[PDB]
Design a protein around this nucleic acid. Sequence first.
RNA 1: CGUGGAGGUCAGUGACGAAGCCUAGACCGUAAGGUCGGGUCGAACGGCCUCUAGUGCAGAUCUUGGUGGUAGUAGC
RNA 2: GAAAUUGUUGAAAGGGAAGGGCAUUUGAUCAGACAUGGUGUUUUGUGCCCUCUGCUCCUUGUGGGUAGGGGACGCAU
Lengths: 124, 190, 169, 136, 392
Amino acid sequence: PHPKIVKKHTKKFKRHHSDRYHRVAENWRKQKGIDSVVRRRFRGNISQPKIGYGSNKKTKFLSPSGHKTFLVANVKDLETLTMHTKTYAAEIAHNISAKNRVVILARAKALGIKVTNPKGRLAL
Amino acid sequence: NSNEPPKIFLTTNVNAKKSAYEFANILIEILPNVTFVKRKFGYKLKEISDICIKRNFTDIVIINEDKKKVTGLTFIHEGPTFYFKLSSIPELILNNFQTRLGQTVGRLFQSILPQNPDIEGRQVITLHNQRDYIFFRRHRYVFKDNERVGLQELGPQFTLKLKRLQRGIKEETEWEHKPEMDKEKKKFYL
Amino acid sequence: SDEIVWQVINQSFCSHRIKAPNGQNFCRNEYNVTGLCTRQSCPLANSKYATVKCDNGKLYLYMKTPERAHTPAKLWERIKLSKNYTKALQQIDEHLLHWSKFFRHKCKQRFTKLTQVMITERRLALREEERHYVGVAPKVKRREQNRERKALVAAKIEKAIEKELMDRL
Amino acid sequence: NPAKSASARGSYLRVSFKNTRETAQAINGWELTKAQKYLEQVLDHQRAIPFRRFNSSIGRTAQGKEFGVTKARWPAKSVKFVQGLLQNAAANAEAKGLDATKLYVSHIQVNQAPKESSPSHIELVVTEKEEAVAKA
Amino acid sequence: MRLLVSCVDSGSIKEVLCNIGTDTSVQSALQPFHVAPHLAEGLKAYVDRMWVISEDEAILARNSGVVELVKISKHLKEPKFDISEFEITSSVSDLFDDAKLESLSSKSVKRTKLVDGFVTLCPIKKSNNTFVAATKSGLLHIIKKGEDKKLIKLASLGLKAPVEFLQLYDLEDTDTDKYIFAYGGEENLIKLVEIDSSFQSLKQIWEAKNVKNDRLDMRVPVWPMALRFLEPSPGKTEKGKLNYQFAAITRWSHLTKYSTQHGRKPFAQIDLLPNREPLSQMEVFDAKGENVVSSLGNFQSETFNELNVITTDYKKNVFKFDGNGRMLGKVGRDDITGSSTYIHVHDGKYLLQGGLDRYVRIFDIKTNKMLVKVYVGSRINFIVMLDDVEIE
RNA sequence: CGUGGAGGUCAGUGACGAAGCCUAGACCGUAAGGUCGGGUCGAACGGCCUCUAGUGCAGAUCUUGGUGGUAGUAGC
RNA sequence: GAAAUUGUUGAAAGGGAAGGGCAUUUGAUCAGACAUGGUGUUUUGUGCCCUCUGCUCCUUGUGGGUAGGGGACGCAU
């Protein structure tokens, strides 16, 4: 197995005053106003991003179920994962058709790789 | 047929999460002598067929689930097997089945639902056929003194659509619905 | 000489390399062990190398050396390998002799994995005849929904019921 | 339920959005012919039609005692158009074969149009209320 | 035309009468003259197979386990044409055994129980009254029709059961007297058996053995569906070995080309289709509508490359292949809606068709156009082309 | 990190649905951003290695367009 | 076919405010494996296993590829 996966901070950072205005969006950006409250970090305001939140190099990039993620298109591509079924799990880039997915599926169970997003575009 | 009561065997998908068991519990009303193993595990369908025949199961109903909504119903009677798929003792009605292919499914739902047909229905199960779509829902049957019979709609509700009809258990397909078969528009089958 | 061919492969690109979202970057070459193009697994800069690979038959150990380096059409030698996992492993660490530890350690593994793969694929060949996957094109959807809606709309569905009941009376 | 229902639509009317709005809202849920009765009674200066929204310059008036409001008005233009809508909705209804004794207005809507007037788009679906909706 | 078609619903035999170009799918096209049921004995007794040596004489194989015999004569109708009346002169009854089958119904993958029925009915020889009638269960009823006008049972013989298909090798001549059958079935390798006109003696002279294990080091299944002989192979005729050539279709879509002089393995086993598509029956046609075949169907020429075959699935499709397997193409692709039960090349220039769809169809080989389509309103398993007729 | 075009390369993906837009779905990044699941849609488009720019928005009594409150108001 | 902005239906709170931060609560709501084996032990067929008999290409080596007659290590049971 793996260590226990700890995010250190699980809440997406929002841009100051994002909600009070639409002409402002939700993608974090800095505050350069030297008067501003969010820049000088007054109590009770939003939390900047800062390096200390950087996660644990051991479990970094790990999806929760414990694997990592690797993004495949055709079967010839997932054959690179014959070795690592214990670390990487592979999922199927969105534009793949419903014709080839089912192929990546069957062959991806034979190899015994975990596909994070099966059930995409496939009924029974 | 009109000899022994239909003694049926309902089933489900392999894993078959909640919704399946739900709709199962909505089936138990419209049929009877209905049991179901409630758990199915890996076997080969030959086995299930045999063990059913020894137990005097005339016919088996297979529910199919997409883990979310029920999709498709296979009816297997030693004889033909139907694959429908669906989108949401009493009396019975059918409509607009007139055809060979139609009267096949007619013979189905006239065999299955009535439970060696019974009577006194103040609530009726209505199967109507519009183009390439079998529907049924269940009303309750109330005369209004002049002519027209008022009804309550007491549910449930959903349409079927026939897709497979094939001769043995699995044996050969005697009809299909292609994707293209509706390239042509006015056909209407049954 | 080889270290250069590496460094070229480590700055310019290989035709084949992947760069997964985390920092590490696969090597999709058909012939390599471990599938990560790094100094010691990238078959293009080694000049001495050995892997295991399925033919659709059993698992041929492919080997190369410096001497056929210039004669690619035939460079990889090839060996078959037994169906005795034990005897196999003995064949593998047999042919590899003073080939360094890397290739015995790893080649053995690739054998183990591909064997297991075979065994699985053999199981799955025998299973679940039922419920194949199927796709449904989008306009298939749209068509079905609408045509259904119109189907119901066309059937006023009580007029049938009542008229059938006046019938039964 | 569409199976038992009838739809009337209107569009590109030239009215006031606000007046048409309310005078649409007032009848939501009413039986058919009592509705026509209403619109009739309200076009002749009997029982005016309450405005819960736009209350500036609206004189206190007694008859609004039915609805909980002292404010109402006798708009001319609006109840004409919606009146007709109820007409043709009744036509669509009858040729459908529906039942005018069950028939009431299940849905009514108005919403703005291009442009400076304030034209409108109206939607109403009457339906025949059925006794005994659902078991279970 | 005048044709016969076995009606599975009532267990009868319809006769169909009409021109080239017929369709019932529309009021426009020209219409069938006549369709008739005859001698409808019930779902048990529906006709398993049918053979007509000469126009008046047609032998019934009847699923009740009963062989009958049919005298045919034309008479006035009710333009102008004639029809016939069909009444049974001779019979020999209860020729089956179910229970021996039923004991193996567990091993097969098929359905529930296994009915006994006739998997072959035909003449021997090509000038002879003899008939070799085969059962699922292995029982071989060999019955020559005595000149007494009556059918008489010559022998009942054993096979290694069940027996799916059986074939007589006539390509040599009528004379040499010592008859070769090849038969096969469930997990049952192809087997060459021989029989004398003493008709009590069958020795198994040859038996195939399966191809080597497949890609997965698993074992390819064994299910030969159908077999058609060729000439012996030219070249140096070799020590100890029968000289024959023949080719067989498996459920598993394997085309299998056997040459004894080579040995016991098939030298070519080639899957025609992706992933184990189940097939059925067979026909050997030729490109030009030509007649290349014996009267029981064995293709005549000594090289496979000159072979072309028609094979069906269990769903709709009907295919045309070469000796190599490269598909020539579908037939009735845009038409057939259902399992195509029966296909017989006729005169090399015609194609019989019929099945669960309930349209009897007739297609042309080289043009690949549907000539004739008739709605009998029944599942029909079998078709025979009677006299091609004028229309008055 | 992202945007527009270019030179390679994935024998990349794509009418079995590319882009795009919606999303009270999920995961990943500390963040810039990224990647998948549904939904609508119809024909092109993306990842790695490098080049080149008309390349990143909340503001400018900013420009152009669309909308509102003001209000069915003052009023005709 | 986006946003602003508006209508309808439903949710929810409100009577003196909305918005944000840390945390749970309650409601709704959604996701939640084609996991279904492994290690052996025995019975028994088949064949890439055994024993005969070949054939072939070349990097001629602790190599591939392939056929036929038979018999009892992988596979199935």
